[PDB]
Design a protein around this ligand. Structure first.
Ligand SMILES: [Ca+2]
Lengths: 56, 223
């Protein structure tokens, strides 16, 4: 799988509380995290099925 | 808000919660039909919740109103966060009382050292996540522009201001964006960004509202 899938979830500098999905390399499952609202990295998805398609 | 205290019930009547299924950002009521928030808090559909204290329990003093028009600043930059300001027109006028009130737009730019009040329902921890039910408050001063620039090299524009403590421990955090920074009864800042929350040498960065008074008034009159 690509390099971004193994990278830790990035909240970013912004201060909003937006629930986004990422892929955990340790657990091997798609979990949720708090995204700040700006400067997203690639391991940041809007839906659970969009995370499973690209990363799984 | 990290290192703050629980605000006295309805002591911040201008504070609103932006909700699209859950609380995601704050905002401030400036007149009976308009709310001001941060541009990064943009969503196509937003419900504005006024008269709130406990975000998770219906108290009976709340007013739920949908957003009719959402207008971001035309010069907003998603990367640099310059011009992080947004206006929200409500679908219907709100009923103004002791629980729901407006905050005044700034008469001028407040100088460094002015004590302000920051509020929100954001994360209360610097490390970890703890989302409060009750509205949190924080008394913090406007920092000198030189100290803001020293903390964030080449990232601070003239449309930004640092509010907080250089030692850390007290700051706004995730869930507080769009929220108010009120100094002497006037809205001087909007919660925008920062590197982490409550970290030493990294105070919160806020949108300097005094540079936008004319844009706000002209947009309200035209829409
Ligand atoms: Ca409530």
């Amino acid at each position: 799988r690509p390099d971004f899938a193994l990278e830790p979830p990035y909240t970013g500098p912004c201060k909003a509380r937006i629930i986004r999905y990422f892929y955990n390399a340790k657990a091997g499952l798609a979990q949720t995290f708090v995204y700040g609202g700006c400067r997203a990295k690639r391991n940041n998805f809007k839906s659970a099925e969009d995370a499973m398609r690209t990363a799984g | 808000i990290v290192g703050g205290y629980t605000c006295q019930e309805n002591s911040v009547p201008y504070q609103v919660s932006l909700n699209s299924g859950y609380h995601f950002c704050g905002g401030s009521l400036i007149n009976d039909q308009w709310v001001v928030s941060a541009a990064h808090c943009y969503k196509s559909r937003i419900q504005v919740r006024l008269g709130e204290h406990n975000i998770n329990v219906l108290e009976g003093n709340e007013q739920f109103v949908n957003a009719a028009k959402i207008i971001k600043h035309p010069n907003f930059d998603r990367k640099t966060l310059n011009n992080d300001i947004m206006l929200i027109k409500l679908s219907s006028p709100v009923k103004l009382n002791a629980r729901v009130a407006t905050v005044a737009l700034p008469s001028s730019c407040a100088p460094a050292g002015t004590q302000c009040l920051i509020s929100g329902w954001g994360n209360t921890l610097s490390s970890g996540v703890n989302e409060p039910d009750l509205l949190q408050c924080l008394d913090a001063p406007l920092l000198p522009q030189a100290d803001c620039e020293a903390s964030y090299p080449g990232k601070i524009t003239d449309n930004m201001v640092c509010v907080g403590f250089l030692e850390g421990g007290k700051d706004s955090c995730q869930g507080d964006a769009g929220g108010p920074v009120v100094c002497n009864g006037e809205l001087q800042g909007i919660v925008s960004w920062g590197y982490g929350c409550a970290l030493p040498d990294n105070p919160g960065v806020y949108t300097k509202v005094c540079n936008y008074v004319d844009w706000i008034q002209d947009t309200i009159a035209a829409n």
